[PDB]
Amino acid sequence: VAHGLAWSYYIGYLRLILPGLQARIRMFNQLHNNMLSGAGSRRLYILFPLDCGVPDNLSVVDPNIRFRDMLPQQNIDRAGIKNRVYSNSVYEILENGQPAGVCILEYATPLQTLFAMSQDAKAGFSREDRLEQAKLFCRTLEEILEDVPESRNNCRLIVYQEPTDGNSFSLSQEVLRHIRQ
Amino acid sequence: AHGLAWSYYIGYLRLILPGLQARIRMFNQLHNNMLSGAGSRRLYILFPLDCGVPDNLSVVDPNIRFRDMLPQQNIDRAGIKNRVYSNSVYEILENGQPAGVCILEYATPLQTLFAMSQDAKAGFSREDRLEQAKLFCRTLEEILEDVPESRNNCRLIVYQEPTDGNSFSLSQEVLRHIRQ
Ligand SMILES: Nc1nc2c(ncn2[C@@H]2O[C@H]3COP(=O)(O)O[C@@H]4[C@@H](O)[C@H](n5cnc6c(N)ncnc65)O[C@H]4COP(=O)(O)O[C@@H]3[C@H]2O)c(=O)[nH]1
């Protein structure tokens, strides 16, 4: 279920990462010349492509999203793993070749799991079903996060769908728009 | 449940199994060939069917003691450059004395299944849990059936408490798997 994946993304990740995020940003700024200085820059921006096309490297889908650095790692004992490592990446977003914004950015990994699952021989299901699962994942997550008062200021969910009708969509522009709000 | 088994395979086992032996070789160069028996060179994963996943093994069975970590494995993942994958090595005691050593952890998504079972809504309602926990293990053994590519870089230790019996010994069960 998208249900289970949403509960998993909360319980196994956001729940653990959001409370410590700002301390990790303060440290990043101390080490990297106050690079994450704007208020728009102190959130985790999470990409939810409802089509579930999720590359591992962001430059594969948009040339204007450039890797810059990692936040300090977070270590937590988890399910018998001592110091399980939780990591996040800081990117610089270009506009017309100009550094236009800096933020912590990533995809919601479970959507990449739905993609792979939907295509497998036995596990598979239709694209229309995957779309509905992806939408349900976002909806179920948004429901969970209403009991998480901190989430509002530590993360931003960017949900979108790629056009297929000849209309242009720039992922970089969209991320910039959120950073700037 | 099904979803969870596929996630665990797709986002974890599929990625870490093919690099496990290289990290074990490196572990052995670093730590005096500690993972010496063939029994010691597998990822042992614990699946308690009641979904009770403590974060500290020594606390549930004092005969299981943390020793060191495998070398880390870094992978670019969904926008995270160099996401870190991590595993821990434990020694297991018998009659007070070291009796075995292996790579050991719990199946983390059982912790998610449990956390779901209470916070209710959602469905909660065990059946919801024991049911889904069995489906999870079933589905995973089914996925790994196939995949002989590497089944034997890992071993699933699926267990529950005996319904009319005595307390199940985690350490003894772990040793039994290593020894086979
Ligand atoms: N022992 C171990 N297990 C891992 C590791 N990474 C993943 N797993 C296992 O597979 C997870 C599913 O991976 P996925 O990346 O698809 O998960 C999603 C992933 O989208 C997110 N997440 C967890 N850790 C990180 C992370 N460190 N960085 C970014 N996202 C993370 O939330 C995860 C749910 O994690 P989880 O409950 O720990 O569950 C299993 C977890 O049991 C790992 O590094 N070590």
Tab-separated table of C-alpha atoms and ligand atoms in Angstrom:
chain	number	residue	atom	x	y	z
A	1	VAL	CA	0.000	0.000	0.000
A	2	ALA	CA	0.793	3.631	-0.402
A	3	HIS	CA	-0.628	3.642	3.107
A	4	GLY	CA	2.184	1.512	4.459
A	5	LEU	CA	4.839	3.414	2.490
A	6	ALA	CA	3.540	6.739	3.841
A	7	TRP	CA	3.529	5.473	7.456
A	8	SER	CA	7.028	4.082	6.803
A	9	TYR	CA	8.342	7.371	5.382
A	10	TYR	CA	7.035	9.112	8.492
A	11	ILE	CA	7.945	6.617	11.179
A	12	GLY	CA	11.251	5.543	9.692
A	13	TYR	CA	12.441	8.976	8.503
A	14	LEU	CA	10.660	12.304	8.933
A	15	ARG	CA	9.850	11.497	12.563
A	16	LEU	CA	13.566	10.949	13.221
A	17	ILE	CA	15.045	13.701	11.012
A	18	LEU	CA	12.817	16.773	11.451
A	19	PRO	CA	13.526	17.463	15.153
A	20	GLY	CA	17.311	17.562	14.544
A	21	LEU	CA	17.312	19.409	11.224
A	22	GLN	CA	17.791	23.020	12.392
A	23	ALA	CA	20.776	22.155	14.646
A	24	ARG	CA	22.296	20.428	11.605
A	25	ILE	CA	21.669	23.579	9.493
A	26	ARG	CA	23.296	25.826	12.112
A	27	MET	CA	26.384	23.583	11.989
A	28	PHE	CA	26.407	23.602	8.167
A	29	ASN	CA	26.292	27.382	8.176
A	30	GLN	CA	29.108	27.510	10.722
A	31	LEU	CA	31.260	25.308	8.442
A	32	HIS	CA	30.244	26.690	5.016
A	33	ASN	CA	30.294	30.469	5.300
A	34	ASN	CA	26.612	30.930	6.229
A	35	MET	CA	25.548	29.539	2.825
A	36	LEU	CA	22.086	28.436	4.049
A	37	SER	CA	21.259	31.914	5.331
A	38	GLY	CA	17.796	32.734	3.981
A	39	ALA	CA	14.731	31.575	5.889
A	40	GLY	CA	13.633	29.872	2.613
A	41	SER	CA	16.900	27.923	2.818
A	42	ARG	CA	16.279	26.263	6.166
A	43	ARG	CA	13.851	23.585	5.174
A	44	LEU	CA	14.100	20.193	3.687
A	45	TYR	CA	12.501	20.359	0.225
A	46	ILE	CA	11.131	17.006	-0.816
A	47	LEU	CA	10.177	16.233	-4.396
A	48	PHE	CA	7.087	14.165	-5.040
A	49	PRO	CA	6.889	13.413	-8.763
A	50	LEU	CA	3.500	11.738	-9.011
A	51	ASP	CA	4.710	9.966	-12.204
A	52	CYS	CA	7.288	8.225	-9.945
A	53	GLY	CA	10.163	8.868	-12.321
A	54	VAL	CA	12.922	9.301	-9.761
A	55	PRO	CA	16.563	9.442	-10.779
A	56	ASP	CA	19.327	9.127	-8.246
A	57	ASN	CA	21.106	12.225	-9.527
A	58	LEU	CA	19.118	15.459	-9.960
A	59	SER	CA	21.143	16.658	-12.920
A	60	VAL	CA	19.676	13.819	-14.963
A	61	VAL	CA	16.284	15.581	-15.097
A	62	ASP	CA	17.294	19.259	-14.789
A	63	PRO	CA	20.687	20.879	-15.510
A	64	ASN	CA	19.967	23.851	-13.175
A	65	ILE	CA	20.032	21.838	-9.936
A	66	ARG	CA	23.645	21.540	-8.843
A	67	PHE	CA	25.022	19.566	-5.888
A	68	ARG	CA	26.949	21.654	-3.438
A	69	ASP	CA	27.524	19.859	-0.130
A	70	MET	CA	26.184	17.532	2.569
A	71	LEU	CA	24.687	18.528	5.849
A	72	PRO	CA	26.540	17.089	8.866
A	73	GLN	CA	25.471	13.447	9.204
A	74	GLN	CA	23.016	12.364	11.844
A	75	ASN	CA	23.756	9.109	13.714
A	76	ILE	CA	21.049	7.104	15.505
A	77	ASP	CA	20.870	3.562	16.914
A	78	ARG	CA	18.102	1.797	14.946
A	79	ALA	CA	16.739	-1.762	15.036
A	80	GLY	CA	20.138	-3.219	16.080
A	81	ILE	CA	22.282	-1.005	13.881
A	82	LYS	CA	24.606	1.161	15.964
A	83	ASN	CA	24.927	4.640	14.466
A	84	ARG	CA	22.663	4.254	11.491
A	85	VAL	CA	23.477	7.266	9.348
A	86	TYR	CA	20.900	9.739	8.145
A	87	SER	CA	22.175	12.027	5.387
A	88	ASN	CA	20.880	15.019	3.385
A	89	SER	CA	22.230	17.014	0.416
A	90	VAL	CA	22.438	20.789	-0.164
A	91	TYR	CA	21.873	21.998	-3.767
A	92	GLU	CA	22.266	25.299	-5.608
A	93	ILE	CA	19.467	26.168	-8.010
A	94	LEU	CA	20.467	28.122	-11.132
A	95	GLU	CA	18.353	30.672	-13.005
A	96	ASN	CA	19.724	31.635	-16.431
A	97	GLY	CA	23.150	30.360	-15.371
A	98	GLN	CA	23.028	32.452	-12.198
A	99	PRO	CA	23.100	31.077	-8.613
A	100	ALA	CA	19.513	31.848	-7.697
A	101	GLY	CA	18.932	29.863	-4.518
A	102	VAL	CA	20.371	27.253	-2.125
A	103	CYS	CA	18.362	24.575	-0.300
A	104	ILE	CA	18.381	21.047	1.087
A	105	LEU	CA	16.696	18.931	-1.582
A	106	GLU	CA	15.767	15.317	-2.306
A	107	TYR	CA	13.107	13.059	-3.696
A	108	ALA	CA	10.643	11.074	-1.646
A	109	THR	CA	12.359	7.687	-2.113
A	110	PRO	CA	9.200	5.542	-1.733
A	111	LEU	CA	7.897	6.850	-5.093
A	112	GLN	CA	10.967	5.304	-6.753
A	113	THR	CA	10.002	2.050	-4.982
A	114	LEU	CA	6.433	2.243	-6.407
A	115	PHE	CA	7.918	2.728	-9.886
A	116	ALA	CA	10.098	-0.388	-9.631
A	117	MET	CA	7.263	-2.400	-8.014
A	118	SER	CA	4.736	-1.449	-10.675
A	119	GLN	CA	6.941	-2.871	-13.423
A	120	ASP	CA	8.032	-6.132	-11.810
A	121	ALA	CA	6.707	-9.378	-13.370
A	122	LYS	CA	4.613	-10.625	-10.420
A	123	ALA	CA	4.388	-7.626	-8.098
A	124	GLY	CA	3.393	-5.219	-10.862
A	125	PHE	CA	0.263	-3.142	-11.307
A	126	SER	CA	-0.981	-0.612	-13.835
A	127	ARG	CA	0.381	2.864	-14.355
A	128	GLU	CA	-3.068	4.277	-13.525
A	129	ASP	CA	-2.967	2.276	-10.269
A	130	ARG	CA	0.546	3.540	-9.514
A	131	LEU	CA	-0.565	7.107	-10.099
A	132	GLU	CA	-3.419	6.572	-7.626
A	133	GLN	CA	-0.957	4.988	-5.157
A	134	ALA	CA	1.397	7.922	-5.517
A	135	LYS	CA	-1.451	10.399	-4.872
A	136	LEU	CA	-2.588	8.310	-1.888
A	137	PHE	CA	0.979	8.259	-0.539
A	138	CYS	CA	1.095	12.094	-0.547
A	139	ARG	CA	-2.386	12.362	0.940
A	140	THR	CA	-1.677	9.846	3.720
A	141	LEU	CA	1.567	11.577	4.563
A	142	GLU	CA	-0.112	14.962	4.713
A	143	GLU	CA	-2.611	13.441	7.109
A	144	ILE	CA	0.122	12.048	9.344
A	145	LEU	CA	1.951	15.378	9.475
A	146	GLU	CA	-1.011	17.272	10.978
A	147	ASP	CA	-0.032	15.676	14.285
A	148	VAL	CA	3.519	16.943	13.669
A	149	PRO	CA	3.462	20.662	14.505
A	150	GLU	CA	7.165	21.011	13.672
A	151	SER	CA	6.879	19.673	10.139
A	152	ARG	CA	5.369	22.980	8.920
A	153	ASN	CA	8.639	24.873	9.315
A	154	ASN	CA	11.235	22.115	8.716
A	155	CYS	CA	10.043	20.637	5.446
A	156	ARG	CA	8.181	21.478	2.273
A	157	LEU	CA	6.410	18.926	0.085
A	158	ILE	CA	6.618	19.753	-3.617
A	159	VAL	CA	4.116	17.574	-5.495
A	160	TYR	CA	3.968	17.733	-9.304
A	161	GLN	CA	3.282	15.872	-12.493
A	162	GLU	CA	5.176	16.078	-15.752
A	163	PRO	CA	3.265	17.565	-18.629
A	164	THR	CA	2.630	15.341	-21.686
A	165	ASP	CA	0.726	17.903	-23.794
A	166	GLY	CA	3.641	20.054	-25.082
A	167	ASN	CA	3.488	22.503	-22.150
A	168	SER	CA	6.777	23.367	-20.476
A	169	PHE	CA	7.569	22.551	-16.856
A	170	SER	CA	10.816	23.561	-15.179
A	171	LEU	CA	11.564	21.670	-11.956
A	172	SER	CA	14.255	24.222	-11.022
A	173	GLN	CA	11.783	27.096	-11.441
A	174	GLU	CA	9.324	25.300	-9.225
A	175	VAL	CA	11.841	24.676	-6.433
A	176	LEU	CA	12.943	28.357	-6.667
A	177	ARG	CA	9.330	29.424	-6.325
A	178	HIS	CA	9.075	27.517	-3.018
A	179	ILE	CA	12.396	28.774	-1.652
A	180	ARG	CA	11.208	32.321	-2.342
A	181	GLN	CA	7.811	32.076	-0.715
B	1	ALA	CA	2.783	-5.601	4.052
B	2	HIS	CA	3.300	-6.669	0.477
B	3	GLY	CA	4.200	-3.121	-0.172
B	4	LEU	CA	6.525	-3.233	2.777
B	5	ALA	CA	8.277	-6.422	1.663
B	6	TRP	CA	8.898	-4.984	-1.818
B	7	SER	CA	10.160	-1.713	-0.351
B	8	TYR	CA	12.542	-3.542	1.919
B	9	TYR	CA	13.838	-5.606	-1.014
B	10	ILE	CA	13.908	-2.778	-3.580
B	11	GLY	CA	15.314	-0.071	-1.287
B	12	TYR	CA	17.650	-2.178	0.770
B	13	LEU	CA	18.476	-5.845	0.088
B	14	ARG	CA	18.710	-5.388	-3.663
B	15	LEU	CA	21.313	-2.633	-3.017
B	16	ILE	CA	23.388	-3.980	-0.141
B	17	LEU	CA	23.639	-7.711	-0.860
B	18	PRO	CA	25.887	-7.561	-3.928
B	19	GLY	CA	28.434	-5.433	-2.033
B	20	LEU	CA	28.297	-7.475	1.224
B	21	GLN	CA	31.189	-9.890	0.628
B	22	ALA	CA	33.546	-7.044	-0.350
B	23	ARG	CA	32.744	-5.231	2.913
B	24	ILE	CA	33.193	-8.475	4.881
B	25	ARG	CA	36.578	-9.020	3.214
B	26	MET	CA	37.499	-5.459	4.212
B	27	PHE	CA	36.145	-6.009	7.765
B	28	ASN	CA	38.396	-9.058	8.019
B	29	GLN	CA	41.499	-7.171	6.930
B	30	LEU	CA	40.714	-4.552	9.609
B	31	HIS	CA	39.768	-6.782	12.515
B	32	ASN	CA	41.968	-9.898	12.561
B	33	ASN	CA	39.738	-12.101	10.408
B	34	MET	CA	36.888	-11.903	12.955
B	35	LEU	CA	34.222	-13.070	10.489
B	36	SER	CA	36.105	-16.296	9.897
B	37	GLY	CA	33.528	-19.111	9.405
B	38	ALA	CA	31.156	-19.273	6.382
B	39	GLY	CA	28.375	-19.028	8.945
B	40	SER	CA	29.855	-15.615	9.863
B	41	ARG	CA	29.774	-14.101	6.349
B	42	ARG	CA	26.010	-13.661	5.931
B	43	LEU	CA	23.599	-10.890	6.879
B	44	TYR	CA	21.308	-12.348	9.578
B	45	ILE	CA	17.994	-10.492	9.762
B	46	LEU	CA	15.593	-10.930	12.686
B	47	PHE	CA	11.849	-10.955	12.045
B	48	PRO	CA	9.961	-11.119	15.305
B	49	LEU	CA	6.377	-11.936	14.248
B	50	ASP	CA	4.962	-9.904	17.133
B	51	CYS	CA	6.701	-6.810	15.455
B	52	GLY	CA	8.509	-5.930	18.701
B	53	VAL	CA	11.723	-4.358	17.410
B	54	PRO	CA	13.946	-2.898	20.150
B	55	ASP	CA	16.786	-0.662	18.917
B	56	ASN	CA	19.325	-2.258	21.223
B	57	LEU	CA	19.943	-6.022	20.991
B	58	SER	CA	22.034	-6.295	24.220
B	59	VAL	CA	19.056	-4.984	26.137
B	60	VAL	CA	16.676	-7.813	25.035
B	61	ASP	CA	19.308	-10.550	25.255
B	62	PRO	CA	22.457	-9.820	27.294
B	63	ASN	CA	24.172	-12.692	25.477
B	64	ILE	CA	24.212	-10.578	22.280
B	65	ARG	CA	26.910	-7.909	22.351
B	66	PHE	CA	27.904	-5.285	19.801
B	67	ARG	CA	31.461	-5.694	18.520
B	68	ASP	CA	32.101	-3.329	15.547
B	69	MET	CA	30.574	-2.089	12.284
B	70	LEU	CA	31.127	-3.290	8.743
B	71	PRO	CA	32.794	-0.700	6.642
B	72	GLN	CA	30.142	1.708	5.354
B	73	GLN	CA	28.715	1.568	1.843
B	74	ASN	CA	27.933	4.945	0.208
B	75	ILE	CA	25.386	5.130	-2.648
B	76	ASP	CA	23.787	8.047	-4.568
B	77	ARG	CA	20.107	7.633	-3.826
B	78	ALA	CA	17.092	9.671	-4.927
B	79	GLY	CA	18.981	12.966	-4.701
B	80	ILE	CA	20.973	12.135	-1.637
B	81	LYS	CA	24.601	12.056	-2.662
B	82	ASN	CA	26.422	9.279	-0.826
B	83	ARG	CA	23.555	7.928	1.253
B	84	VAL	CA	25.235	5.764	3.891
B	85	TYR	CA	24.326	2.092	4.328
B	86	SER	CA	25.431	0.612	7.624
B	87	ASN	CA	25.616	-2.812	9.331
B	88	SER	CA	26.770	-3.980	12.803
B	89	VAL	CA	28.715	-7.101	13.888
B	90	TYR	CA	27.775	-8.877	17.124
B	91	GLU	CA	29.270	-11.623	19.232
B	92	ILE	CA	26.925	-14.056	20.743
B	93	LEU	CA	27.527	-15.733	24.118
B	94	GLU	CA	26.730	-19.213	25.374
B	95	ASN	CA	27.277	-20.198	29.050
B	96	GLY	CA	28.988	-16.836	29.571
B	97	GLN	CA	31.532	-17.372	26.805
B	98	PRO	CA	31.791	-16.157	23.217
B	99	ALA	CA	30.254	-18.811	21.048
B	100	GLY	CA	29.645	-17.083	17.734
B	101	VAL	CA	29.959	-13.902	15.703
B	102	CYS	CA	27.871	-12.493	12.896
B	103	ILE	CA	26.283	-9.504	11.113
B	104	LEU	CA	22.942	-9.003	12.820
B	105	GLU	CA	19.932	-6.627	12.779
B	106	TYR	CA	16.145	-6.480	12.996
B	107	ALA	CA	13.838	-6.068	10.000
B	108	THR	CA	13.013	-2.382	10.585
B	109	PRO	CA	9.671	-2.291	8.764
B	110	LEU	CA	8.131	-4.514	11.483
B	111	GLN	CA	8.646	-1.476	13.691
B	112	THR	CA	6.552	0.491	11.201
B	113	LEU	CA	3.847	-2.192	11.254
B	114	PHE	CA	3.715	-1.975	15.003
B	115	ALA	CA	3.724	1.797	15.130
B	116	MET	CA	0.778	1.635	12.761
B	117	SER	CA	-1.124	-0.845	14.943
B	118	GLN	CA	-1.658	1.526	17.757
B	119	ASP	CA	-1.933	5.028	16.359
B	120	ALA	CA	-5.377	4.017	15.191
B	121	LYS	CA	-6.533	5.392	12.973
B	122	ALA	CA	-5.079	3.952	10.772
B	123	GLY	CA	-6.471	0.467	10.554
B	124	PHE	CA	-4.530	-0.910	13.505
B	125	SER	CA	-6.744	-3.850	14.483
B	126	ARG	CA	-4.524	-6.829	14.877
B	127	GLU	CA	-5.397	-9.134	13.082
B	128	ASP	CA	-3.766	-6.267	11.280
B	129	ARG	CA	-0.355	-6.924	12.663
B	130	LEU	CA	0.333	-10.647	13.068
B	131	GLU	CA	-1.341	-11.163	9.785
B	132	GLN	CA	0.697	-8.570	7.927
B	133	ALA	CA	3.896	-9.647	9.701
B	134	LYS	CA	3.602	-13.189	8.311
B	135	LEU	CA	2.683	-11.894	4.846
B	136	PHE	CA	5.788	-9.686	5.005
B	137	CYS	CA	8.135	-12.610	5.731
B	138	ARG	CA	6.331	-14.870	3.282
B	139	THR	CA	6.581	-12.304	0.506
B	140	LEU	CA	10.245	-11.652	1.232
B	141	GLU	CA	11.270	-15.352	1.119
B	142	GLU	CA	9.258	-15.446	-2.127
B	143	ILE	CA	11.169	-12.489	-3.548
B	144	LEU	CA	14.502	-13.910	-2.532
B	145	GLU	CA	13.453	-17.275	-3.980
B	146	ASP	CA	14.634	-16.295	-7.375
B	147	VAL	CA	17.515	-13.999	-6.649
B	148	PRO	CA	19.842	-16.955	-5.931
B	149	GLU	CA	22.226	-14.423	-7.235
B	150	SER	CA	22.529	-13.853	-3.559
B	151	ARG	CA	20.104	-15.399	-1.127
B	152	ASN	CA	23.078	-16.734	0.718
B	153	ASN	CA	24.521	-13.390	1.529
B	154	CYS	CA	21.632	-13.213	3.975
B	155	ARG	CA	19.416	-15.356	6.151
B	156	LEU	CA	15.984	-14.582	7.464
B	157	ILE	CA	15.429	-15.589	11.079
B	158	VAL	CA	11.665	-15.570	11.496
B	159	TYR	CA	10.377	-16.343	14.977
B	160	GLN	CA	7.582	-15.927	17.475
B	161	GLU	CA	6.951	-16.972	21.055
B	162	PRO	CA	5.696	-20.555	21.462
B	163	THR	CA	1.911	-20.335	22.077
B	164	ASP	CA	2.020	-22.754	25.045
B	165	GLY	CA	5.782	-22.981	25.550
B	166	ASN	CA	8.630	-21.148	27.228
B	167	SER	CA	10.392	-17.902	26.479
B	168	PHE	CA	12.146	-18.066	23.094
B	169	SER	CA	15.922	-17.565	23.301
B	170	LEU	CA	17.080	-15.076	20.712
B	171	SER	CA	20.773	-15.881	21.278
B	172	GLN	CA	20.288	-19.620	20.940
B	173	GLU	CA	18.219	-19.151	17.791
B	174	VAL	CA	20.886	-16.940	16.321
B	175	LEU	CA	23.609	-19.425	17.161
B	176	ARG	CA	21.531	-22.218	15.580
B	177	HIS	CA	21.460	-20.307	12.280
B	178	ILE	CA	25.154	-19.488	12.282
B	179	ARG	CA	25.936	-23.123	13.117
B	180	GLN	CA	23.923	-24.514	10.168
C	1	LIG	N1	20.056	-1.639	8.076
C	1	LIG	C1	19.698	-0.681	7.220
C	1	LIG	N2	18.520	-0.726	6.621
C	1	LIG	C2	18.177	0.199	5.753
C	1	LIG	C3	19.001	1.206	5.452
C	1	LIG	N3	18.392	1.949	4.573
C	1	LIG	C4	17.213	1.402	4.320
C	1	LIG	N4	17.080	0.309	5.059
C	1	LIG	C5	15.969	-0.633	5.188
C	1	LIG	O1	15.167	-0.419	4.094
C	1	LIG	C6	14.404	0.710	4.471
C	1	LIG	C7	13.605	1.024	3.268
C	1	LIG	O2	14.487	1.893	2.451
C	1	LIG	P1	13.927	3.076	1.717
C	1	LIG	O3	15.212	3.873	1.357
C	1	LIG	O4	13.128	2.568	0.641
C	1	LIG	O5	13.161	3.691	2.887
C	1	LIG	C8	12.613	4.925	3.190
C	1	LIG	C9	13.411	6.093	2.814
C	1	LIG	O6	12.565	6.725	1.855
C	1	LIG	C10	13.489	6.947	4.128
C	1	LIG	N5	14.809	6.883	4.793
C	1	LIG	C11	15.259	6.118	5.774
C	1	LIG	N6	16.516	6.426	6.001
C	1	LIG	C12	16.867	7.379	5.162
C	1	LIG	C13	18.004	8.041	4.959
C	1	LIG	N7	19.038	7.751	5.706
C	1	LIG	N8	18.129	8.981	4.033
C	1	LIG	C14	17.025	9.275	3.260
C	1	LIG	N9	15.848	8.581	3.479
C	1	LIG	C15	15.802	7.655	4.418
C	1	LIG	O7	12.519	6.351	4.945
C	1	LIG	C16	12.802	5.059	4.672
C	1	LIG	C17	12.051	4.079	5.531
C	1	LIG	O8	13.154	3.577	6.270
C	1	LIG	P2	13.108	2.409	7.199
C	1	LIG	O9	11.895	2.369	7.994
C	1	LIG	O10	14.345	2.506	7.975
C	1	LIG	O11	12.974	1.025	6.425
C	1	LIG	C18	13.766	0.149	5.634
C	1	LIG	C19	14.981	-0.257	6.342
C	1	LIG	O12	14.554	-1.390	7.064
C	1	LIG	C20	20.176	1.311	6.037
C	1	LIG	O13	20.960	2.218	5.802
C	1	LIG	N10	20.561	0.357	6.944
